[PDB]
């Protein structure tokens, strides 16, 4: 419902209820792991080799066919078994060339149960009895300073949780214009949220075809390794439209020139460096995590006056989200050629 003759100053920056949600989602994220398998018996010596493929001298393959000893359900007998792994999960322990897993010198790892999914769902927060939730309903409102038309509500609208670093996905659309928001734009150490109006459709796929293969470690244990790859060993990639992206940069340059003078050169560049999942951008597409080079978008400059863009990705299998000291998560491989369609909505 509505409310009149009323004005409240807001804040997004020293706001609460976001400080507890980053605790809530992590604390709830841990609960969907403890009923699942631990990988103590799998940190073991690996015997790896290249997958069958026409290999080049300069360029490199990205899949390693590895065989290893493993226990059975019984304790006396052992078995030899093999799987496929990525380059980003084995390191070389130091003729022959034998590897090991990457996270075994820091923490035992948790396989997620393949029954549970990681797809986003709507979450409506609600305030208990004796509180209220106000909502600014302004059109032109930079998120800081007094909103002139508030409206109370019982519960929030649809809030889905996604996970992405650059180019946040399935977001909330702006009303008419394109809005930039920040804490203090003359400062640089704070990020700049950019929320635009027309969503850029993004297709993302892996064209490779998998097979999962169950390995019994002991009683009631199932390591879902990757079986054989049928067809052409291909690289996962994403597509966006050329003209829509050239348009939506043209909108945000027109918006950015309000704070910086009309006679200003604005240009874009690739990320300056660091760890993996902040240089690229990450997302989960139906139960598998991508890391996709985004040099192909931010190569521009802007003067003060049928095709598409492909961009290639990489796939890790173990994640280390929120950079926790005693944590990893082996993800289960999924069947078939995989793709998903999303709406790029904001930038950071």
């Amino acid at each position, epitope marked *: 419902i509505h409310l009149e003759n009323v004005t409240e100053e807001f804040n997004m920056w020293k706001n609460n209820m976001v400080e507890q949600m980053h605790t809530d989602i992590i604390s709830l994220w841990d609960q969907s792991l403890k009923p699942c398998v631990k990988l103590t018996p799998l940190c073991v010596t690996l015997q790896c080799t290249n997958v069958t493929n026409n290999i080049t001298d300069d*360029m490199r393959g990205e899949l390693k066919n590895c065989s290893f000893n493993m226990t059975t359900e019984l304790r006396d007998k052992k078995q030899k078994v093999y799987s496929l792994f990525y380059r980003l999960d084995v390191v070389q322990i130091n003729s022959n060339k034998e590897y090991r897993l990457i996270n075994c010198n820091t923490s035992a790892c948790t396989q997620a149960c393949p029954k549970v999914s990681f797809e986003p769902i709507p979450i409506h927060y609600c305030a208990p009895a004796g509180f209220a939730i106000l909502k600014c309903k302004d059109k032109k409102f930079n998120g800081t300073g007094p909103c002139p038309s508030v409206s109370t509500v019982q519960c929030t609208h649809g809030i889905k949780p996604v996970v992405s670093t650059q180019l946040l996905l399935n977001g909330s659309l702006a009303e008419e214009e394109v809005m930039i928001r920040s804490e203090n734009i003359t400062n640089n150490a704070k990020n700049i949220l950019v929320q635009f109006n027309t969503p850029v459709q993004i297709n993302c796929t892996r064209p490779n075809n998998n097979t999962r293969k169950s390995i019994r470690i002991g009683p009631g244990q199932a390591f879902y390794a990757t079986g054989d790859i*049928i067809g*052409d060993i*291909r690289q996962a990639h994403c597509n966006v439209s050329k003209a829509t992206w050239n348009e939506t940069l043209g909108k945000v340059v027109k918006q950015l020139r309000k704070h910086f003078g009309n006679n200003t050169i604005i240009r874009f560049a690739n990320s300056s460096g660091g760890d993996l999942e902040v240089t690229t951008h990450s997302f989960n597409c139906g139960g598998e995590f991508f890391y996709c080079n985004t040099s192909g978008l931010f190569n521009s400059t802007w003067i003060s006056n049928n095709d598409s863009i492909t961009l290639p990705c990489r796939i890790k299998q173990i994640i280390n989200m929120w950079q926790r000291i005693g944590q990893c998560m082996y993800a289960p491989p999924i069947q078939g050629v995989i793709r998903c369609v999303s709406n790029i909505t904001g930038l950071i």
Partner: antibody
Amino acid sequence: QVHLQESGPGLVKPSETLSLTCNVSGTLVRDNYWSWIRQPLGKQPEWIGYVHDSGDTNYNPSLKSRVHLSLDKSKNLVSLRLTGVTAADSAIYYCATTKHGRRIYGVVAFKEWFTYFYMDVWGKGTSVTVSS
Amino acid sequence: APTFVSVAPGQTARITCGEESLGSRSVIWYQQRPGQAPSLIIYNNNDRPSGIPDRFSGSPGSTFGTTATLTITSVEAGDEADYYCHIWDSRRPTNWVFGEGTTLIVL
């Protein structure tokens, strides 16, 4: 109207620098990709490989050392040199042309394609005999 | 080594050759008349060049895990020649030798 004409010494002692020639018709040496193929008697042919002007000089890794192909822009021929003729070298030899083709299966920008070759026409041959 | 493709004339012959497929391929079919030079008959997976006769149909190269076949209909006495396949698999390396000969004899 294209056809070729092979010629070699014909009776070859072992451990000898073999050489071969190939005469052309209609199409000159500059125009098309060339190829030499051997075939033993009663056996499958062995594609020794292909050659072209300007750095298209890939060889078979089977021999890889004792074979060197050559061209003749002056007399308009295609020639071949082998080093160290062995007893298994007794095979009928074929100079021939071939045509390219780009088989594309994925994304072109990611080098997900490959070039294949196929011999359109053939020669006559010369039974190179290795013996004392 | 010579697989016997004894077929009655007017019937359909099916010649298999080469290794079982792994990736997307491109096959070339040749033939070898006795006493003569080779000659191409099929150059893509299902394409024959100009001037060549018809009735030499090729299997599509997108099938994953089969052997390269070649379908002939209505054979004759002039079709008596040894055959060779030449596969180009997009996973295995470069084939520096042809397939094994499948000789064709008409009834």
